[PDB]
Amino acid sequence: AAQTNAPWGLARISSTSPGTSTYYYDESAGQGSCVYVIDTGIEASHPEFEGRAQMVKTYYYSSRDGNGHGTHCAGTVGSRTYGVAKKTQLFGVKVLDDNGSGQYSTIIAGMDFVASDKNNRNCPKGVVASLSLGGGYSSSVNSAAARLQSSGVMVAVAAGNNNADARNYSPASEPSVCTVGASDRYDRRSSFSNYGSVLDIFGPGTSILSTWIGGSTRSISGTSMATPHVAGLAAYLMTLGKTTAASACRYIADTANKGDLSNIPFGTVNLLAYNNYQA
Numbered sequence: 096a097a098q099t100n101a102p103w104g105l106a107r108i109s110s111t112s113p114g115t116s117t118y119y120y121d122e123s124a125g126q127g128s129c130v131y132v133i134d135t136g137i138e139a140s141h142p143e144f145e146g147r148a149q150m151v152k153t154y155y156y157s158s159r160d161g162n163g164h165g166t167h168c169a170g171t172v173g174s175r176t177y178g179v180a181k182k183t184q185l186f187g188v189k190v191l192d193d194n195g196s197g198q199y200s201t202i203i204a205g206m207d208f209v210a211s212d213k214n215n216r217n218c219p220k221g222v223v224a225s226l227s228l229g230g231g232y233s234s235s236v237n238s239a240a241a242r243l244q245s246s247g248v249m250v251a252v253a254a255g256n257n258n259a260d261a262r263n264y265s266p267a268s269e270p271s272v273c274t275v276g277a278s279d280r281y282d283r284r285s286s287f288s289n290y291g292s293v294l295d296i297f298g299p300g301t302s303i304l305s306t307w308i309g310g311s312t313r314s315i316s317g318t319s320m321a322t323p324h325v326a327g328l329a330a331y332l333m334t335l336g337k338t339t340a341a342s343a344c345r346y347i348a349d350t351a352n353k354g355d356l357s358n359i360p361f362g363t364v365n366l367l368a369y370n371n372y373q374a
Contacts, residue, residue: 096122103280104299109370113282119372125180128330129218130172131209132225134165137187138308143174148185154201161193163308168227170306171323177305179327206239210246221333221340225326226252227319233265240266249340251326253318254289261289268293273344277321283357290363298324298368325368
């Protein structure tokens with residue numbers, strides 16, 4: 096399948112070269128997989144989600160995304176125009192309030208929630224969790240992401256937008272999950288992107304056009320925007336039978352576009368998420 100005039104990030108994950116504008120993907124498109132977007136929530140009523148997104152859990156007075164960040168992330172995972180996995184199921188876990196802030200303890204509980212909630216969902220092709228959040232290092236936030244990973248969910252987390260080593264950020268520094276950096280349309284490490292030996296992969300992260308609350312769209316930047324590119328890619332790959340939750344991060348790294356990004360600090364992987372789809 097081919098989505099013309101796709102967002103550059105979508106065209107990039109399916110391209111060996113930058114500068115193209117067409118998504119290419121297997122039409123299975125993540126049928127039968129599930130991606131939890133652990134964030135500010137999802138505007139499930141957005142027409143771009145086609146009834147494939149729903150709020151399954153909030154820790155605040157409402158489960159609506161009064162922020163947009165979670166709606167933006169969910170849209171990159173699996174919206175129809177904006178999404179990597181256009182047929183995945185999206186589950187929203189609102190651990191971040193509408194200013195985008197959440198206590199670590201709520202974030203931890205949201206990670207334990209998904210690790211059990213997946214047993215209440217129909218995801219025969221596998222489960223992904225997209226964690227476009229993070230803060231300073233926390234062994235308990237790290238261990239919660241490890242538990243979620245260990246439970247059979249791919250966890251993709253943002254490296255962080257500090258332009259530093261992600262070793263000092265959680266859950267970015269948890270080695271067993273998939274720590275995602277950000278790159279821009281010219282295949283430079285997204286200016287803001289964290290780095291370090293803990294990073295597994297890079298996704299498109301600068302000026303990513305996705306869904307926005309109020310039924311709208313907008314373009315924003317962040318390793319929080321690269322993470323749903325990898326979360327969606329994983330759901331896409333699991334549906335195709337190419338990898339499992341336990342090995343998705345790695346498979347994505349094994350099959351990545353290698354040595355194509357610039358301003359990648361020594362010691363950080365030069366891997367760009369690539370769906371390896373041949374039309």
